[PDB]
Amino acid sequence: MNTRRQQAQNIRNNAAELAANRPHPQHINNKEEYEYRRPKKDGNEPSHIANFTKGLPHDEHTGLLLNSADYDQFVLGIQSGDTTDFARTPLGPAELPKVHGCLSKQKIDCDDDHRSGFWKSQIAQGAAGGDGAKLRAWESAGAGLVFDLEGPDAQAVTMPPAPRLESPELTSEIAEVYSQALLRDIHFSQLRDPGLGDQVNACDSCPTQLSIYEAIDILNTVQIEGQNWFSANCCDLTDDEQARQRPLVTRQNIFRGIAPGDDVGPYLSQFLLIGNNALGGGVFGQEAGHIGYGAIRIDQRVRKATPCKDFMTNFETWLDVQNGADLRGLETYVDADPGKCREFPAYRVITTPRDLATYVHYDALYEAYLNACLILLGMGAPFDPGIPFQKPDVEDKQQGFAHFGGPQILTLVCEAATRGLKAVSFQKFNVHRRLRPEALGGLVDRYKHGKGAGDELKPVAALVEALENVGLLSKVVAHNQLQNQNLDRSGDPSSAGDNYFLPMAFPEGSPMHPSYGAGHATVAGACVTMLKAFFDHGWQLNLGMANGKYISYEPNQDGSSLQQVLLDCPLTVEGELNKIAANISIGRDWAGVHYFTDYIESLRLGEKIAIGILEEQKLTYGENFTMTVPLYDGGSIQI
Amino acid sequence: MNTRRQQAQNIRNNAAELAANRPHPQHINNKEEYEYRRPKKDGNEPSHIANFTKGLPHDEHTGLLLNSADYDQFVLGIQSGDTTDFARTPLGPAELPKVHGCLSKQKIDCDDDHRSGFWKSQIAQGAAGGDGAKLRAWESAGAGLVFDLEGPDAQAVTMPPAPRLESPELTSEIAEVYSQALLRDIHFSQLRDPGLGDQVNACDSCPTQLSIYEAIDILNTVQIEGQNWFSANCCDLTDDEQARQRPLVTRQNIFRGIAPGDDVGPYLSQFLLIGNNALGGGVFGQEAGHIGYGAIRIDQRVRKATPCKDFMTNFETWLDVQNGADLRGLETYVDADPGKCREFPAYRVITTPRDLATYVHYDALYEAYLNACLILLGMGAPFDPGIPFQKPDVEDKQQGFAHFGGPQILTLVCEAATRGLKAVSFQKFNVHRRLRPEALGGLVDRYKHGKGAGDELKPVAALVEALENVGLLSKVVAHNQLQNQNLDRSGDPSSAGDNYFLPMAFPEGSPMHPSYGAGHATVAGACVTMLKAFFDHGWQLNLGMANGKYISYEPNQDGSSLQQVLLDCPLTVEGELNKIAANISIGRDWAGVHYFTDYIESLRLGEKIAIGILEEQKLTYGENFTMTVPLYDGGSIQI
Amino acid sequence: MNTRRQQAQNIRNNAAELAANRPHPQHINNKEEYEYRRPKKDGNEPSHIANFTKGLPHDEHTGLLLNSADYDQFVLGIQSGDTTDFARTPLGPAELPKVHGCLSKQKIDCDDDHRSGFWKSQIAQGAAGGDGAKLRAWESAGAGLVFDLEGPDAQAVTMPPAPRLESPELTSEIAEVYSQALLRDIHFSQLRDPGLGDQVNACDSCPTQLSIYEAIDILNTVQIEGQNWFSANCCDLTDDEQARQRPLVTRQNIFRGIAPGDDVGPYLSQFLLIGNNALGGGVFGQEAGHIGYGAIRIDQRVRKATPCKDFMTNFETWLDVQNGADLRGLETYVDADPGKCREFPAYRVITTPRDLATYVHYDALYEAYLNACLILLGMGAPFDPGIPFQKPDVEDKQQGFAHFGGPQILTLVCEAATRGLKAVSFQKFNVHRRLRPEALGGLVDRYKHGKGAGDELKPVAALVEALENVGLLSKVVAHNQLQNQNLDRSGDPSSAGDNYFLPMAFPEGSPMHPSYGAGHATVAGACVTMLKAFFDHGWQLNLGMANGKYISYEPNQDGSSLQQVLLDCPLTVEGELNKIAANISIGRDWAGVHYFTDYIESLRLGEKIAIGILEEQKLTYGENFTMTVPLYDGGSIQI
Amino acid sequence: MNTRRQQAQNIRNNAAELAANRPHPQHIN
Ligand code: NA
Ligand code: NA
Ligand code: NA
């Protein structure tokens, strides 16, 4: 034998070696960083239009990257991770220097207690009780360089290159993210084939410049050089692009993930609507929406944000956000009705993408995937049959709580997320640095106003044609027109003119870190993979059945209760975990802060992080069991 | 430089070595295992009265360990961890073999679909809809042998020896756990010095055979060989016992933990009563009891179990539980009132120890410590000033989300718990194997009925004197008398006679694993230590103040809302985290499944697990910061 | 220099490291294991219909997996490899326990000398001279966990996921394996384009419900969701499926392998028909069928099993086999004719798939590939020109016998096979666990009798449609009708009704180990790869030529002698080795125990095992030569 | 536990050492 000290050290060294001896891939970007250029005096420099520049100095007149030297310093700081190198990077509004090639001078500083004059938008000017908005910096840029004790390393795993401005793929994606902004107040029952059950309209009537029927046509018709993303055959596409590729847009498969079981049933996953039966003697049912949080409850009702109230719809509002104006918590929320119980309608069931965007806005990491984990445990969901002490207590003479029970999975959903964020943080900051969809909506507008210098915005030219030739932009300007009649931005100079800016559900828009690699989807992919591994992924949810059809749940007209939907086949653990993975992941896309590529490839990156942890932790147990974890790309694996 | 693969492997090897090079202590029990004996034909064998035997065959007539060979096989199985060795261990009721020294024969098996006849209690006989209760086995016995990737090893950390039946310490502890059973329906406002604010009685009037005033006297007067635990000076006590030692019992310090800040304010920690202010525009306040779970809410109202309804109050009910009768979920809960909102009183505020016992009954691991973590984040609580990117965004030009924000602490509270359970699982199963307080209540009764053989129960003799000489038992028999008038156990033969059994708030009583080392307290200690480390432990909670006194919260008469309590000094993050640590940890003691020693030493074991993880994870970051984590034993440490 | 001891140790350490430093792939199944479910009381459990359950307890009334707990114990035993864990797994017929979730009780045991009453089929009831059939257990389940001194490790190599019940691929495969059962007595001259030479009918006239012309149409027309396997373009298929994919079924390419040279010439490889010229002075020719086994001969005539006599054609016969009834050697064989020499027709030339099924039934591992090796050596076949001492003896002054002659290759064909079996044993038992084609024929029948519970056999529904819509099943029931008129199973209750069971050429059917990964094909692929490596793969076989056409051999009407076939081009060593690889590998498929996927992917797995050994053994020799081993997937490699 | 790769390599190294640690005789004509 060996002393336990040695055995414990050996296993931690074996896990460390196992992690190292796996395939360490090479990180390949789409080369957009230094490809698209613009003009300087007696030469040319890169435009960095296709790069994330949110927080840096943007020209206050043109809304383009003010100084390229700022981005070169921003990039430098990312790779070093030195706190000192962050401090040299200019932030928010700035003045271009008198000597060319030098770093920009930051207008706002520590002695600026009153910051009203620096911003050009009314909202930002009187944001902090009349003082004016504050600067906000980038979030955990050096997290990609942070190591970990378990799972694969952040740079020991990679995502494929982001699609380009010239590509047919991106054109379909920006159109999809654009469409969702105009379809942001649609009732969820509309996002599915009408044969399943009766659909309804959102009780709150909003001005709509786009419907579902139109959106499917636009997404199917949108094309570059006579090629549509959904239409294009395999032969044309690259091995990387062949993987992401989706089919022709259907009422059922619209705005949905490509993970198995996403198509089956309604849009919204049960684990975002249903709860558990009341502890002990049942006072309420699963349709109540109270999760069985041990002896206390979880309310499944999200905070209701005032419908059809999108932000950054004009240039000033957009520019100030892109100049790192801290506008968090300036979005308004519907007040409660004294007559009604359970703080309705202040807190209602997630009825529209807006309410998903709101849920996802403050989601707080792994909440959604823990909640789903809690729901299954309370329901009486079985664990993967490979796991020890799973048989009747009399026969096996052991139950298993500490390491093969609820306790182990409760920690695992939470564990994985942290490793997830670090892994994607590298892909965002140190590799791809893809612009936010809000920025592309920026690029689209500025081009249509003939802004920039020379052939700077020529790359975007191809993109805006398809968006206008499908007739989408014409509806976006109409939607924006009505949004700029709001008193908060009515007097903004840009409100009078046309705006092609993609509406943001949040005043601040996207978080202060690059687009490519989604923080929500990476956590979603990782946390869900752990749940699918541990639980019996096939387990058909016993939500009950009526009239020989297995019942499901979607919200009612005002989200006051759940409307039952009756399907031919029952819902499985796998599908609903994959659906809530997709719901939260695409939940950002509805808010207009992510593309589909950000979701899909993050979900694939997420499972690699999660699988790696499970692989490494298997060295510890001497029971010698098997955990069968299903993947999003077809067949399952045996850990 | 080195390639990232090598650096990542080196850090995981360095963490593994750091863990090994720390002090690996030697595990010392109190030698009770094979000390107390009883008689066999022409010799003597150990009684195993002071050991955990719950689940094994107990003699149906005497309620003592039927065969010592069963315990020797039970012990053997623990140390091996072999699934086959578990299967040989007899469970529940059994028949003593015709040849002596041989293993007992199990009555119940896989062909016993109807198990009514095997049980001697009415409740268990008609438990499973008339079929009869099923056998339940021991929970994760082999978890002590499971290794881990981060933190200290389970056998690389130890707890001091459990107190003995002869000791003054245990006598005070069993009296404390006994008292709590009779004080189980007391309103929490009573568990504090009355000078702070107006106290109240529980709206539900229960027959009480013991009051607070009496309980303090009993705990202060109870003594062995003219020595009281709280009275005894340092000189008399051992270095291990000097640490646990508490002061003379006060109205303020009664049934409370010895962690700093437990004495200050009411009994119940705020993080078990208060919530967050409503997201965005405030529709309700913190006194509401809705935690700011991102965009959804957490209900702080526990399920209300029918008051003054304790179980295992007679021999039959006690014996069947001790014979591993699965009675989970047979406890009844108060129905809701249609007229009232928020499912009242079915779901009410934690008003009595019963409601804490109920909360803790299904607590689901780290819920309480995550909830507390969520509350602080929503409040706007500051992190430990050592942590990077903590200064204004403009100055430092970075915020930190992924690794130095909410995300990192959210995973850490959840992370630590799993490592905690494995560490204590060893101390329970492989080392101390201390009997449950319910078992000691068993030993007390059987002695007072002159059960057992020869000088078997002589060890307990000394214990029962002090309990009777304080006049406690006389009140326990009176409490039990009224409890056995219930129709569910009225017709049980033992109901007619006197019962000295400690009432259990759960029908099944303690979980199927030994007493010493508390699973709740180990998680509590570990999770709270992580919170204290990350957050500014000193941060005075801004709950508001009225009349120049800082306001606090305790429940009202029916737990319909929070009653404000006004203190001279404000509550700190440290104290309330230490109080919720103690609340949940002692929450078991109220249910009657743990002693104080199980709490205190687990809280100390818990922080060692947590600190060890933090120490190891510090190798990853290159920022070079400092986390100042305060300890329960005075001064703070710098990680 | 180094001492030889050190050099010898270094090379064995270098080989060990080389093996480890190669790509270790991750084992991915199709997730069918826990996907398809059925109903239990108040819940749902997995059906394990798509898993190998042969030997376990099958319900005697429905013919489905009796208890899922048995499979969970069966799986557990596989992964542990513990002899004790095998013994707990119930075998053959069993009684479902009174408590649910418990292990089944085995009817047959060691005190059952007379086992007539346990079986439901006449054949099995009077199998062991009236005593009744015995139980048979699973074959080398723990061989996947066995290590090796040379070649790649069993878990250091993997096969792609098995096709699913829903898939178009499987539907084409089961139709192919079904067709072969009805075409089992076809003369081999029919399995090729008729332009090559005159075709003939099997002298023994059997009732045929299917012809070649019909079988090609059925295989080309069979489709799922309007998709045929052979018709489907690359774009639709996955990278794994794109590899297996075959072209539209031709008279030449029907039931043939996709290895280069399989299409060229007749179906049956020469090395299964031809022999060598008589040692010294030629008394007979190559058309004789006597292999030059040094100074003795090998008879190429297989034992003739009585034609059109298939087994397990009814439910009882099928069920008893699936309940592990040991029926080995109950198949009857044609008696010899006293008048004729060389024990004819008792021993005849392999004339029909039946005779191949019979050859392959007792093939005894590597016999076929050694025989082929012996034939080439006797013919005067050249070795790969890279090998040392290959030139005229006078010039080079060395011949090479021990290490570069016959001796080295003779051991290599035999060597590789053992490593092959262990490698695939893992893929069968520990990963894929694909049901046998006989089991799917079982699933098809039970569905058509409306057996099982709820939506248990719904997965198979899609499969049986295509089989009936092509009109195949209608012919299978007709074939089965005539087979159940046999007196051995005439009185079996199921004989009266319709049977859709795929006929088995063996009474026992498939061997006691899962379908996916073929033991014959893995050995075939491995052994043939070694032969192709060593010999000059291109070497055009000098069998002679007549009328300016290179002669070949196929059998005559009664397999009394070889009928010559004249082709435009000569046969190469590569093609005929690939053809005998395919012949033996597909030889199982004719018997109805394997699919095409089992052959193709095993042949690819086989070469990886073989190449790995050759790579490792190259460290030993200091001659520094090159062995050019051709692959089945196009180009050759240089070892 | 160890990863199968390591266990498989260790056994092949153990076999190689076992072979070397046996009596290596001197060849006398
Ligand atoms: Na169990
Ligand atoms: Na900050
Ligand atoms: Na030669």
CSV table of N, CA and C in Angstrom, one decimal, chain C residues 205-289:
chain,number,residue,atom,x,y,z
C,205,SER,N,-31.9,-27.8,-54.6
C,205,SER,CA,-33.0,-26.8,-54.9
C,205,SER,C,-33.7,-26.5,-53.6
C,206,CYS,N,-33.7,-25.3,-53.1
C,206,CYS,CA,-34.4,-24.8,-51.9
C,206,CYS,C,-35.5,-23.9,-52.2
C,207,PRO,N,-36.6,-23.8,-51.4
C,207,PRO,CA,-37.7,-22.9,-51.6
C,207,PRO,C,-37.2,-21.4,-51.4
C,208,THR,N,-37.2,-20.6,-52.4
C,208,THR,CA,-36.7,-19.2,-52.4
C,208,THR,C,-37.9,-18.2,-52.4
C,209,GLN,N,-38.0,-17.3,-51.5
C,209,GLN,CA,-39.0,-16.3,-51.4
C,209,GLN,C,-38.4,-14.9,-51.8
C,210,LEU,N,-37.1,-14.9,-52.2
C,210,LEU,CA,-36.4,-13.7,-52.6
C,210,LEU,C,-35.2,-14.1,-53.6
C,211,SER,N,-35.1,-13.4,-54.7
C,211,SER,CA,-34.0,-13.5,-55.7
C,211,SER,C,-33.1,-12.3,-55.6
C,212,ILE,N,-31.9,-12.3,-56.3
C,212,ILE,CA,-30.9,-11.3,-56.4
C,212,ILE,C,-31.6,-10.0,-56.9
C,213,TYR,N,-32.2,-10.0,-58.1
C,213,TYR,CA,-32.8,-8.9,-58.8
C,213,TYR,C,-33.7,-8.1,-57.8
C,214,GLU,N,-34.5,-8.8,-57.1
C,214,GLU,CA,-35.5,-8.3,-56.1
C,214,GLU,C,-34.7,-7.6,-54.9
C,215,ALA,N,-33.7,-8.3,-54.4
C,215,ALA,CA,-32.8,-7.8,-53.3
C,215,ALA,C,-32.2,-6.5,-53.6
C,216,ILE,N,-31.7,-6.3,-54.8
C,216,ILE,CA,-31.0,-5.0,-55.2
C,216,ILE,C,-32.0,-3.9,-55.2
C,217,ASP,N,-33.2,-4.1,-55.8
C,217,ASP,CA,-34.3,-3.2,-55.8
C,217,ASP,C,-34.7,-2.8,-54.4
C,218,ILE,N,-34.9,-3.8,-53.5
C,218,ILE,CA,-35.3,-3.6,-52.1
C,218,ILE,C,-34.3,-2.7,-51.4
C,219,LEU,N,-33.0,-3.0,-51.6
C,219,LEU,CA,-31.8,-2.3,-50.9
C,219,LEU,C,-31.7,-0.9,-51.5
C,220,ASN,N,-32.0,-0.7,-52.8
C,220,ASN,CA,-32.0,0.6,-53.5
C,220,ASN,C,-33.2,1.5,-53.1
C,221,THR,N,-34.4,0.8,-53.0
C,221,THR,CA,-35.7,1.5,-52.8
C,221,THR,C,-35.9,1.8,-51.3
C,222,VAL,N,-35.5,0.9,-50.4
C,222,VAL,CA,-35.7,1.0,-48.9
C,222,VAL,C,-35.2,2.4,-48.5
C,223,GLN,N,-36.1,3.1,-47.7
C,223,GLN,CA,-35.8,4.6,-47.4
C,223,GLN,C,-36.6,5.0,-46.1
C,224,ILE,N,-36.1,5.9,-45.4
C,224,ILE,CA,-36.6,6.5,-44.1
C,224,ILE,C,-36.8,8.1,-44.3
C,225,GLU,N,-38.0,8.6,-44.1
C,225,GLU,CA,-38.3,10.0,-44.3
C,225,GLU,C,-37.9,10.4,-45.7
C,226,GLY,N,-38.1,9.5,-46.7
C,226,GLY,CA,-37.8,9.8,-48.1
C,226,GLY,C,-36.3,9.9,-48.4
C,227,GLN,N,-35.5,9.2,-47.6
C,227,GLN,CA,-34.0,9.1,-47.8
C,227,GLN,C,-33.5,7.7,-47.8
C,228,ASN,N,-32.8,7.3,-48.8
C,228,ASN,CA,-32.1,6.0,-49.0
C,228,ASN,C,-30.6,6.1,-48.7
C,229,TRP,N,-30.0,5.2,-48.0
C,229,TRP,CA,-28.6,5.2,-47.5
C,229,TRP,C,-27.7,5.3,-48.7
C,230,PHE,N,-27.9,4.6,-49.8
C,230,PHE,CA,-27.0,4.5,-51.0
C,230,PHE,C,-27.3,5.7,-51.9
C,231,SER,N,-28.5,6.3,-51.8
C,231,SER,CA,-28.9,7.5,-52.7
C,231,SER,C,-28.5,8.8,-52.1
C,232,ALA,N,-28.5,8.9,-50.7
C,232,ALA,CA,-28.2,10.1,-50.0
C,232,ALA,C,-26.9,10.7,-50.4
C,233,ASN,N,-26.8,12.0,-50.6
C,233,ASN,CA,-25.6,12.8,-51.0
C,233,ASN,C,-24.8,13.0,-49.8
C,234,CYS,N,-23.5,13.5,-49.9
C,234,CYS,CA,-22.5,13.8,-48.8
C,234,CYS,C,-23.1,14.8,-47.9
C,235,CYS,N,-23.6,15.9,-48.4
C,235,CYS,CA,-24.1,17.1,-47.7
C,235,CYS,C,-25.0,16.7,-46.5
C,236,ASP,N,-25.9,15.8,-46.7
C,236,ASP,CA,-26.9,15.3,-45.7
C,236,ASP,C,-26.2,14.5,-44.6
C,237,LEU,N,-25.2,13.7,-45.0
C,237,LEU,CA,-24.5,12.7,-44.0
C,237,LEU,C,-23.5,13.4,-43.2
C,238,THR,N,-23.1,12.8,-42.0
C,238,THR,CA,-22.1,13.2,-41.1
C,238,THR,C,-20.7,12.7,-41.6
C,239,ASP,N,-19.6,13.3,-41.1
C,239,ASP,CA,-18.2,13.0,-41.5
C,239,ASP,C,-18.0,11.5,-41.3
C,240,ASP,N,-18.5,11.0,-40.1
C,240,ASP,CA,-18.4,9.5,-39.8
C,240,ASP,C,-19.2,8.7,-40.8
C,241,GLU,N,-20.4,9.1,-41.1
C,241,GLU,CA,-21.3,8.4,-42.0
C,241,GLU,C,-20.9,8.5,-43.5
C,242,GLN,N,-20.2,9.6,-43.8
C,242,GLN,CA,-19.7,9.9,-45.2
C,242,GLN,C,-18.6,8.8,-45.5
C,243,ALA,N,-17.9,8.3,-44.5
C,243,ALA,CA,-16.8,7.3,-44.7
C,243,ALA,C,-17.4,5.9,-45.0
C,244,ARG,N,-18.4,5.5,-44.2
C,244,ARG,CA,-19.0,4.1,-44.4
C,244,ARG,C,-19.7,4.0,-45.7
C,245,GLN,N,-20.4,5.1,-46.2
C,245,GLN,CA,-21.3,5.2,-47.3
C,245,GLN,C,-20.9,4.4,-48.5
C,246,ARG,N,-21.8,3.6,-49.0
C,246,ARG,CA,-21.6,2.7,-50.2
C,246,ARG,C,-22.3,3.3,-51.4
C,247,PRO,N,-22.0,2.9,-52.7
C,247,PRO,CA,-22.7,3.4,-53.9
C,247,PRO,C,-24.1,2.7,-54.1
C,248,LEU,N,-24.8,3.0,-55.1
C,248,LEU,CA,-26.1,2.3,-55.5
C,248,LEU,C,-25.7,0.8,-55.8
C,249,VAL,N,-26.6,-0.1,-55.3
C,249,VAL,CA,-26.3,-1.6,-55.3
C,249,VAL,C,-26.3,-2.1,-56.7
C,250,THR,N,-25.2,-2.7,-57.1
C,250,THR,CA,-24.9,-3.3,-58.4
C,250,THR,C,-24.8,-4.9,-58.2
C,251,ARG,N,-25.0,-5.6,-59.3
C,251,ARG,CA,-24.8,-7.1,-59.3
C,251,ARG,C,-23.4,-7.5,-58.8
C,252,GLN,N,-22.4,-6.6,-59.2
C,252,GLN,CA,-21.0,-6.8,-58.9
C,252,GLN,C,-20.7,-6.5,-57.4
C,253,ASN,N,-21.2,-5.3,-56.9
C,253,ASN,CA,-20.8,-4.7,-55.6
C,253,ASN,C,-21.8,-5.2,-54.5
C,254,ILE,N,-22.8,-6.0,-54.8
C,254,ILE,CA,-23.8,-6.5,-53.8
C,254,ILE,C,-23.1,-7.4,-52.8
C,255,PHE,N,-23.4,-7.1,-51.5
C,255,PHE,CA,-23.0,-7.9,-50.3
C,255,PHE,C,-21.4,-8.0,-50.3
C,256,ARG,N,-20.7,-7.1,-50.9
C,256,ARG,CA,-19.2,-7.1,-51.0
C,256,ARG,C,-18.7,-5.9,-50.1
C,257,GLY,N,-17.5,-6.0,-49.7
C,257,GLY,CA,-16.7,-5.0,-48.9
C,257,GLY,C,-16.3,-3.8,-49.8
C,258,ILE,N,-15.9,-2.7,-49.2
C,258,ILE,CA,-15.5,-1.4,-49.9
C,258,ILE,C,-14.0,-1.3,-49.9
C,259,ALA,N,-13.3,-2.4,-49.5
C,259,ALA,CA,-11.8,-2.5,-49.5
C,259,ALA,C,-11.4,-2.6,-51.0
C,260,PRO,N,-10.3,-1.9,-51.4
C,260,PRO,CA,-9.8,-1.9,-52.8
C,260,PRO,C,-9.6,-3.4,-53.3
C,261,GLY,N,-10.2,-3.7,-54.4
C,261,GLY,CA,-10.0,-5.0,-55.1
C,261,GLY,C,-11.1,-6.0,-54.8
C,262,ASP,N,-12.1,-5.6,-54.0
C,262,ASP,CA,-13.3,-6.4,-53.6
C,262,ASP,C,-14.2,-6.6,-54.8
C,263,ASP,N,-14.4,-5.5,-55.6
C,263,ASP,CA,-15.3,-5.5,-56.8
C,263,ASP,C,-14.7,-6.4,-57.9
C,264,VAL,N,-13.4,-6.3,-58.1
C,264,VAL,CA,-12.7,-7.0,-59.2
C,264,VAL,C,-12.9,-8.5,-59.1
C,265,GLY,N,-13.3,-9.2,-60.1
C,265,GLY,CA,-13.4,-10.7,-60.2
C,265,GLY,C,-14.7,-11.2,-59.5
C,266,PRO,N,-14.7,-12.5,-59.1
C,266,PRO,CA,-15.9,-13.1,-58.4
C,266,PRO,C,-16.0,-12.7,-57.0
C,267,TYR,N,-17.1,-13.1,-56.3
C,267,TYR,CA,-17.3,-12.8,-54.9
C,267,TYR,C,-16.2,-13.4,-54.0
C,268,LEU,N,-16.1,-14.7,-54.0
C,268,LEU,CA,-15.2,-15.5,-53.1
C,268,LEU,C,-13.8,-15.3,-53.5
C,269,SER,N,-12.9,-15.0,-52.5
C,269,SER,CA,-11.5,-14.8,-52.7
C,269,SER,C,-10.8,-16.2,-53.0
C,270,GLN,N,-9.8,-16.2,-53.9
C,270,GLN,CA,-9.1,-17.4,-54.3
C,270,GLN,C,-8.6,-18.2,-53.1
C,271,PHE,N,-8.1,-17.5,-52.1
C,271,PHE,CA,-7.4,-18.1,-50.9
C,271,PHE,C,-8.4,-18.9,-50.1
C,272,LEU,N,-9.7,-18.9,-50.5
C,272,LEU,CA,-10.7,-19.8,-49.9
C,272,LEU,C,-11.1,-21.0,-50.7
C,273,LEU,N,-10.7,-21.0,-52.0
C,273,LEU,CA,-11.0,-22.1,-53.0
C,273,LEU,C,-9.7,-22.8,-53.4
C,274,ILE,N,-8.7,-22.0,-54.0
C,274,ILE,CA,-7.5,-22.6,-54.6
C,274,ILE,C,-6.6,-23.1,-53.5
C,275,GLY,N,-5.6,-24.0,-53.8
C,275,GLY,CA,-4.5,-24.5,-52.9
C,275,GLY,C,-3.2,-24.1,-53.5
C,276,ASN,N,-2.2,-25.0,-53.3
C,276,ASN,CA,-0.8,-24.9,-53.9
C,276,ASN,C,-0.7,-26.1,-54.9
C,277,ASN,N,0.3,-26.1,-55.8
C,277,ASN,CA,0.8,-27.2,-56.6
C,277,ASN,C,1.5,-28.2,-55.6
C,278,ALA,N,1.3,-29.5,-55.9
C,278,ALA,CA,1.8,-30.6,-55.0
C,278,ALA,C,3.4,-30.4,-54.9
C,279,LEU,N,3.8,-30.6,-53.6
C,279,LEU,CA,5.3,-30.5,-53.3
C,279,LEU,C,6.1,-31.4,-54.2
C,280,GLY,N,7.3,-30.8,-54.7
C,280,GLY,CA,8.2,-31.5,-55.6
C,280,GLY,C,7.5,-31.8,-56.9
C,281,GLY,N,7.5,-33.0,-57.4
C,281,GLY,CA,6.9,-33.4,-58.7
C,281,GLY,C,5.3,-33.3,-58.6
C,282,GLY,N,4.8,-32.4,-59.4
C,282,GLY,CA,3.3,-32.1,-59.4
C,282,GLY,C,2.4,-33.2,-59.8
C,283,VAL,N,1.7,-33.8,-58.8
C,283,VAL,CA,0.7,-34.8,-58.9
C,283,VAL,C,-0.7,-34.2,-59.2
C,284,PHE,N,-0.9,-33.0,-58.7
C,284,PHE,CA,-2.2,-32.2,-58.9
C,284,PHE,C,-1.8,-30.7,-59.1
C,285,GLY,N,-2.8,-29.9,-59.5
C,285,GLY,CA,-2.6,-28.4,-59.8
C,285,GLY,C,-3.2,-27.6,-58.6
C,286,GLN,N,-3.3,-26.3,-58.9
C,286,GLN,CA,-3.8,-25.3,-57.9
C,286,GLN,C,-5.3,-25.4,-57.8
C,287,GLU,N,-6.0,-25.8,-58.9
C,287,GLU,CA,-7.4,-26.0,-59.0
C,287,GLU,C,-7.9,-27.1,-58.1
C,288,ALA,N,-7.0,-27.9,-57.6
C,288,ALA,CA,-7.2,-29.1,-56.7
C,288,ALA,C,-7.9,-28.6,-55.4
C,289,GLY,N,-7.3,-27.6,-54.8
C,289,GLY,CA,-7.8,-27.0,-53.5
C,289,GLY,C,-7.0,-27.6,-52.3
